[PDB]
Symmetry: D2
Subunit: 497 residues, 4 copies
C-alpha cells in the first residue's frame, strides 16, 4: 500500500537528444492489433518502433483473418529474428448492453422514470428499455446507480421487481441502441468465460502459440482458477492476466493477484465503475502490489488517442506514459482506437522515447533499496542470489545480467528487483522465451537443450556483442542453477583473443 | 535536480467516497477567465467548486469588458466573503506569426523549398511566406528547425540572408495565414514587454488590484528585472511569475527563478520548443527546484479539454492533475479552451476532487524529512521556527497553523515545508492577503492593524470555528514575531467557556 | 532493547587540548563523600573539578559527623553560589554476611562439604559457618551457587534443611569473618528498608534537604512503591533511585523503572550476581531503557581506583568513563574507595575532561533523530514543544535552552532529547532546582515566584552572560507555559543597548 | 572519522548462559607469551581458551629459550591441529632511558631545576641525570614536557644546549635509575629498527615461521617502507604491523596505514605521549579508519591486570574488552604482565566469553549497510563479489562463507564487511593460512595445490561438519576465482546421501 519511486532529473537530459535504439528500452509495449495495423510491412514497422507483445480480441473479424492475423505476425517475426513477440488474447467476458429502440434513439429527460426490463426482445422507448443482463433485478438494489452508453446517463434504482427495475434518470441525454451498461459497486453474475471464448481458447488460441489470456472483468480469485481449471494441461503454460475493471476486482485484488500470472489495467469499464478522481489511486496501488509480489503489470496509456489535427501528443498523454513507467509498470499499452486509426507506428515510437527518458531518470540504487526494505525477511536462496546479481550489476556497472532459466522463474526473480541493465534470459523452452516479454527489462533468446552452462554463457556473450548489448571491456553477470545446491552468480569480463 | 514524493494509498480511500468541502483543499486552482465563464452567477459557481486565482490575458476583448470583467469578479467576491481571490494578468510578450497568403491557404509539400521573408506585407504562397519576426535571419542558422501552425510543419533552415531565409519543408501539410511560429533552441530577440503591455500594467493592471504578472516567454534573469524595473514602486507589491516556454528559459531556469516570485508552466509554446518526450522532465525538474527554494509554481493541467461527447474526463487527464499535485505543484491551472467552452464549473470541480484525493494519500512525515534533508545546513531563525511549527503540527495532529504576517514572508516559510493542515495567514496588508493564494495550503484572512497579537490569535480561532476549520478539543499552532528577537511558536487548544 | 550512539572523532580534537571550564560539561558527576573528601576546602576543590551530586551512606560514621558532613556541604555551597549541589542518600537495604569463626580464619578446601547454619551466634570453622540471612534455606535450592567474600569462594547447594543448608566448596580459598554473601539468581526475602533506614530517612534525611534516595537491592516495583508509601507527603518531593544489583532487579527492570524517578548502576553486588561477561550487556540495556523513557541514570565508573603508584588512570578506566557517556548516561559516579583514599579531586578532574571529550565527539543531529525514531507515535503537546526547542537550538546553533519550570517536568522533557547546548532551568521551587542535577545538561537557577515570564527570561539572560553561558550575538531558546494552552517556544538573540 | 556500531541487547541474552565453544568466536586473541605461559600444557590450555596469535619480544630471554619457545609452540600446534597459530614478533625500536644515579635513587622536588645530559656514563643526582637519547637537545624546545619513569615526573624544558637541556621539575617524586622517558609531541630521531633487530628478523624471525612484525614506535610511512625495504624478498610474505605509540604516529596515521598490513594499539607509550582523556578518541578513530580500509587492527585490552586478590575481572576491564569488540577491532590482546603473572588461561577465557557476548549483540544487517554507505562508489569486481557473499549469507542465514584464496586477498575482502558467520578460508600457501588469523572471523585450513575448485569445496564442507561448523540442512556460501573473469559466488546446501 506504501509507494515510492526515486527520480533524478538533470538539465543535461532535458537538452541532449536521445539516439538510443528504441528496442533497448526496459519498459515493454503491448500494442492492440487493429484493421490497418496488420500490413506485414507495418507490424515490422511497429517492431522497429518498440512493440513487444501483440494484443487482439476475437470480438470482431472473421475466423479467416483471425488466423490471417496470426501468420502475418508469425512471418513478421521471421523478418526480424532478434525480436520474439508475445501473443495476448483478450477475452470478452461478462458484458451488459441495452436493447433495441422503436426510434432507435430516445431523449431520456432528467427526472423522468425509466423501466429496465429483462425481456431483451422488447423494443423500447424513453419510458422502458431492455437490458441484456437477465439477472439485473437480483443484483442492483434501490439506490444503486446504473450507467448507460459509457456513462452518458446515470439512473438511480427506485424499484426492483422479478423481471424489471424502475429507475430515475439523473441527467438528460440521447441514447442509441445496444449501448454498454455498468453497475458500479455491484457484482455482475455472469460466467467469466463463454462457451465461444472457451473453444476460442482451447482449440484456436493455444494451438497458434498464444501466451497470455487477458481475462476481462475478473471479480474474484475463483474466476481465475475456474479459468485455469478449464484450460487444463493443454494450456498449463499460458499466463492468465486478470483485467480489473470494477469495484469487485479492486476489493479482492490481493487474492486475485495470488492466483494470477499478472495484471492488466484496461482502458474501459474501470472508468465507469469507479469515480474518475479515484482511478489514479487504484492504478498506482495495483502497480505497487504487483511490484512487491514480482508479478508483471500492463497499464493502458493514452497516446495520440484523439487527433482532429496532425499526430503530436498532448502533454497529458506524455505524462500519463511517463508516470506509468515511473509508477513501476512492466508494460505500457496502446489500445485499439489509440493507434489513432491512422498512426499506430508514430504512437508506439513516441511511447518508446518516453519510456527511455523515464527509465534514464530513475535512481536505481535508491529503487533497489526501496524494494528490499519493502519485501519480507524470509527470502529464499533463489531470490537472494537473484538479488545479488542485481546489486552486483549496479555496483560494477555491468552491461547485462545473463540468466539461464527454463521455466522463466530465474528471470522473474531478477526482474522483481528492477536492474538498470537488460536481463538476457536464455531458455530452451519456446513457451518461456515468449512468456517473459511481459516482465520489464527481460529480453529472451532461445537456446538448445542439453548444453553445458559455460558454453551457453559465452554463446550468449557473442550474440550480445552482435546485437550491441555488450562491448569489449564490459562486465556481465551470469546467473544459473536457480532451481539446489546449484544457485550460482558469476561475473565475467568481455574479451576476445 | 533530485526528486521524491511519498504516497500511501489504501484500499479504503479508493472505496470510501469523499464528502470534504472542495475549498478546504491545499492545492489551489488558477482558472483562466473566458467569455462564458464570466456570469457573476458562474464565477460564484466557480468559487464554490474551488477557484482561488483568476487568470486573464488582454490579448482579446475590449477595454470595456476587461474592467467589466474586473467588477464582476470584485462583486462575485462580495457574495462569498470567505474567499479572497487572486488576480493574475498574463502578458503577451514575444510572439511570432506567419504572413498573409494569396489563396489564404497553401499546401506545402514535403521536400519543397520555402522562403521566409521579413517583409510582413508580402502576400505569400507555397514558395515564400512572410514572418512577423523581423530578426528571424539573424537568429536561426542552417540546420535550425522552424515550426509553423502549432508545429503542423517543420522547416530546416538551408540559407540565411539579410531579409529572408530559405528552408526545406520536412512534412507536407496545409497552412492558414497568420499562424504561430516557434524556433526551437533559438533565443528570440524581441522585447519582453510591449508598450501596450507596459501601459496595460502601469495604468490599468495595478490600479484594479492585480497581484500577479505572468510574464510570457521569459528567457533570462534580465527579462525579469527589466520587467521589475519598469513597474517601479507603483507596482513593488506585484508578484512577477515568469513563464518558461522555450529552451532558453530552461537553460537559465535557476537564475530566472532567483529573480522571480514564482513560476508558471504554461500550456503552449513549450510543447513545440521541446520534444514531447522531454517535457515531463522539465515540468518535474522545475517543480522540484521551486519546492526547494520555497517559490510557488503553477502547472497547467488538462481537464475536459476535448469533448465531442458529455463532460467525463479521460484517464490521462485525471493522472495529469493527480501527478502534478504529487510532483509538488502549488497550483494546478485550467487554461482558456480547457473550460471546454461550455463546462468550466464541472472541470474545476473534478480538479478539486482529484487534488483532495492526491493530498490525502501523501505521507507528510516522509515528505517533511525529504525536504529537510534537501535544504542546506545554514537556515535562519525565521525558517527554523517556521520549520518547528510544521513538525509540531504533524506530531500533535494540529488542525491549523495560524501565521501572523504582514509581508507574507512568515506564511511562505511555512508553506515551503508543506504541512498536512491548513496555514491560516493573518495580515493587515491587502496586498499580502491576495498574494499568498499562490502558495499551497495558505488561506488568508485580513485583520486590522495596531492589534495585540493575542487578540488577533483567538479572533482567528473564533472565525476558524465559524468556517469549520477547527473544532473544540483541537490543537492549533500560532506563529508570529517572524521579522528579532520575537520569533515565536505557540500551541493553544480550542476551548470555550 | 535496540541501541545506537553516533560519534564523530576528528584528528583535530585528538591533538588540540581542551581548555573549556570543567563545570560546563553536560554529564554530571556523583561523588561519594568519604572521610578525607570532607575538608570544606576539598569539597570546594571537588566542586571546581566537576562534582554535581554528593553521595553518602549512613552505614558508618556517627550521627555527629553525618550532619557535620551536611553543613560542611551546605557551607561549601555558599562559597560557590553558581553551583547547586544535589544530595543523595544511599540506603543499606538487604545484606547477607557470614558469621564469626573460631580461628577467625578458615582455609576452605575445594571439594569439601560446608554447612551454612542460620544460628548467627554459632562460631564456625571450615566445616560449618553461620549466615546472617535467616531464610537462606527457604530461598536457595540444590544446584544454586552461594558466593562468599566478594565471590572469593563459590559453594553449590547440595542439601536444604529447616535451619541450615549443605554445600560443596568449588574452589579453595581462605576466608575472614563477617564477609559478604551473594545468592545469584535467587530473590532475597529481606525488608527493602530497615527501621533504622526508615527513621534515618523520615526524621534526618528529609529535614536536611536530601533529594535522592538510592534504594539498595531493589528487586520489584513493589519495593519501590513500598518505599514511596512510607515516605508519605513528608517526602513526596524526594526522588527514589532504585539500585539494580542482582538478577531479580534485571528481570523486573521495566516495571521497576516505571515506578522509579531514576536508576543507579552501583559498583558492588551486580558483579557477583551476574557473570562478569554479561554485566556490560545489562549496563548498556538499562541506560538505553532509561534514555527512551526520559528517566535519568547514574553509572558507576572506575577512575584511579587502585594506585600502588602515582595517580595516572589506566586505559580501561578512561574508556569505561568515556563509553558510559557515549552509552548515554546522565551521571558518571565516583564511588567510595575510588577517590583513591588520597586523590578524589584528581579523579573527578580527569572524569570531567573525559566527559567533555566524549560529549564533543557526539553527532547530536544523528542522536536526536535516533531518539525520535525510537519513541512512540502519540507524544503530547508538552513533549512536542520540548522536542521543538532541541531541534531549533541545533539548527540555529543556539547557546542555551532556557526552560521555565516549577516541578521540573519541562526540563526533563528537554533533557530526554539530549541537546548539544546547556539546558538552563529556572524554578521557584527549591526542591526542583536540586532535583534536576541528575539529568544530563540541566543547570538550575532559583528564581522568585509571582514574576512575569518575560522578566524571568532576560534576567536569566543577564546572569547567563555573567556566567559565560552566552555572549552577545548568540541565539537562545526560551520555553515555558508547559503545564495548556500555554505551551510556548521562543527564540531571542542576545543584545544589549 | 565518522563512527557507528549497532547493538541489539535483549534481556534473554543477559540471563541465558553461553555454552558456545570459545574458539568459534569471531574476534581473535593476541596473547603475549611470558615466562610461565610457556608450558606446552599451558599453551594448549591457552589454545582451548581462545588464543589465535602468539606474541613475543626478544627484549629479554636467551637465544636458547627464544627458539625453545618456538618449538614448544610448534609442538603445541601438533596437539591441536584444528588451530593454526599466528606468530607475531614485537620489535624494540626507538627507546629512551634515564642514566644511573649516585644513590641509585633521587627525590626530585617540585620547582627544582634538573639538567639532562647526553653523556650516558655520567652518574647523576637530583640536579643532573643522563639521558640515553643523544639527540634530546636537538629534538625538544623550551616549553616541551619530558616524562620520566612512566610519567612519574614531568619536566618542562627551560634551556636547550649542545650536550644537555635544563628543565624545571613540575611534580615531586622519587626516581630509580634507567627509567623510561617520553617526549610528548616531539618526533624521536632514532633508527626505526636496530642492527640487533634487523638480524633478529632476517636470520631468526623469518626462518622460524614468523608472520607478523609489530614495529614499535612507527612515526611515518617512511619507517614502514624502510622496514619493508630491508626485509626484502626473503620476507616479502611477512605482515608489517606498525605500533602507533606517540603523537607523530597519530598525525601521520593515514599514510602509515597506507603502507601497512595492519595496526596494533599497544599498551605502553601512547598513555604518556597523549593525555589520558584523549586516548579513547585515538583508539576509536584508528579502529574506524582500519575498518574502512579493510586493514586489521589489534587493540590492547586490560583483563586481570592487577590482582591483589583472586582472579575476578573488574567492571572496567570487562567493558574495555567488550567496547573494543563493539568499536570494531579484529583482535583483542593480552599483554605481558596482564596474564597476571599467574592466570593467563583464566584471562583469555574471560576475554573469549566477552567477545562472544559482544558479537552476539551486533545487528549485522545494520553494520553491513553502515560499512557500504561509508565506502566509496568505485569498488572492484572482486570487492563487489565479496560483498555479495556477505549479504547473501545474512539474508539466507548461511552457516559459513567458504573462501578459496591463495594470497588471502579474497578472505580479507570478505572480512572487511564483517559477516555474522565464520569465513572459512582455504589456501595452499602456508604463509597465507597463518597470516589471515589477524582478521576477524577468518578461520583458515590448508589444502593441497592443483585441485579442482569443486573438490576443494565439498572437502571443506566435510571437515566443516567434522568441526561442528556446519550441519545438515545448512546453506553455505562458496566464493572463488577472485583474482578475471572468474569471480564467482555459489550457494550450496549441506546434504549427504
Ligand atoms: Mg470487460
Ligand atoms: Mg508566449
Ligand atoms: Mg546492596
Ligand atoms: Mg615502543
Amino acid at each position: 500500500a506504501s509507494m515510492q519511486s526515486a527520480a533524478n532529473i538533470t538539465l543535461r537530459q532535458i537538452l541532449e537528444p536521445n539516439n538510443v535504439n528504441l528496442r533497448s528500452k526496459k519498459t515493454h509495449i503491448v500494442c492492440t492489433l487493429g484493421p490497418a495495423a496488420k500490413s506485414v510491412e507495418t507490424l515490422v514497422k511497429l517492431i522497429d518502433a518498440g512493440m513487444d507483445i501483440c494484443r487482439f480480441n476475437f470480438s470482431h473479424g472473421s475466423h479467416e483473418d483471425h488466423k490471417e492475423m496470426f501468420n502475418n505476425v508469425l512471418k513478421a517475426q521471421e523478418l526480424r529474428p532478434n525480436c520474439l513477440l508475445g501473443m495476448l488474447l483478450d477475452t470478452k467476458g461478462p458484458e451488459i448492453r441495452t436493447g433495441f429502440l422503436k426510434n432507435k434513439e430516445v431523449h431520456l429527460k432528467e427526472g423522468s422514470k425509466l423501466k429496465l426490463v429483462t425481456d431483451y426482445e422488447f423494443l423500447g422507448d424513453e419510458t422502458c428499455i431492455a437490458c441484456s443482463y437477465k439477472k439485473l433485478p437480483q443484483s442492483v438494489k434501490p439506490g444503486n446507480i446504473i450507467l448507460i452508453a459509457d456513462g452518458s446517463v446515470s439512473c438511480k434504482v427506485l424499484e426492483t421487481h422479478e423481471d424489471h427495475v424502475i429507475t430515475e434518470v439523473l441527467n438528460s441525454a440521447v441514447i442509441g441502441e445496444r449501448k454498454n451498461m455498468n453497475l458500479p459497486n455491484v457484482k455482475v453474475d455472469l460466467p467469466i468465460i463463454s462457451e465461444k471464448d472457451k473453444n476460442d481458447i482451447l482449440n484456436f488460441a493455444i494451438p497458434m502459440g498464444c501466451n497470455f489470456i487477458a481475462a476481462s472483468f475478473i471479480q474474484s480469485a475463483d474466476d481465475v482458477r475456474l479459468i485455469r481449471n478449464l484450460l487444463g494441461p493443454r494450456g498449463r503454460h499460458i499466463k492468465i492476466i486478470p483485467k480489473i475493471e470494477n469495484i469487485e476486482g479492486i476489493i479482492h485484488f490481493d487474492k486475485i493477484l495470488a492466483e494470477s500470472d499478472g495484471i492488466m489495467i484496461a482502458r474501459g469499464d474501470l472508468g465507469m465503475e469507479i469515480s474518475p478522481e479515484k482511478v489514479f489511486l487504484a492504478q498506482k496501488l495495483m502497480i505497487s502490489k504487483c511490484n512487491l509480489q514480482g508479478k508483471p503489470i500492463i497499464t493502458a496509456t493514452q497516446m495520440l488517442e484523439s487527433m482532429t489535427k496532425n499526430p503530436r501528443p498532448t502533454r497529458a498523454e506524455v505524462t500519463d506514459v511517463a508516470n506509468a513507467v515511473l509508477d513501476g509498470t512492466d508494460c505500457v499499452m496502446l489500445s485499439g482506437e489509440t493507434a489513432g486509426g491512422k498512426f499506430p507506428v508514430e504512437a508506439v515510437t513516441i511511447m518508446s522515447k518516453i519510456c527511455l527518458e523515464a527509465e534514464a531518470c530513475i535512481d536505481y540504487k535508491l529503487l533497489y533499496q526501496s524494494l528490499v526494505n519493502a519485501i519480507e525477511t524470509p527470502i529464499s536462496v533463489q531470490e537472494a542470489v537473484a538479488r545479488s546479481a542485481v546489486e552486483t550489476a549496479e555496483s560494477i556497472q555491468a552491461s547485462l545480467i545473463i540468466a539461464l532459466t527454463e521455466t522463466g522463474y530465474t528471470a522473474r526473480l531478477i526482474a522483481k528487483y528492477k536492474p538498470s541493465c537488460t536481463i538476457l534470459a536464455l531458455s530452451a523452452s519456446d513457451s518461456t522465451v515468449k512468456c517473459l516479454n511481459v516482465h520489464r527489462g527481460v529480453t529472451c533468446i532461445k537456446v538448445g537443450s542439453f548444453q553445458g552452462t559455460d558454453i551457453v554463457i559465452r554463446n550468449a556473450i557473442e550474440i550480445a556483442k552482435q546485437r550491441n548489448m555488450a562491448k569489449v571491456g564490459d562486465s556481465v553477470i551470469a546467473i544459473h542453477g536457480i532451481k539446489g545446491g546449484t544457485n550460482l552468480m558469476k561475473v565475467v569480463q568481455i574479451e576476445l583473443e
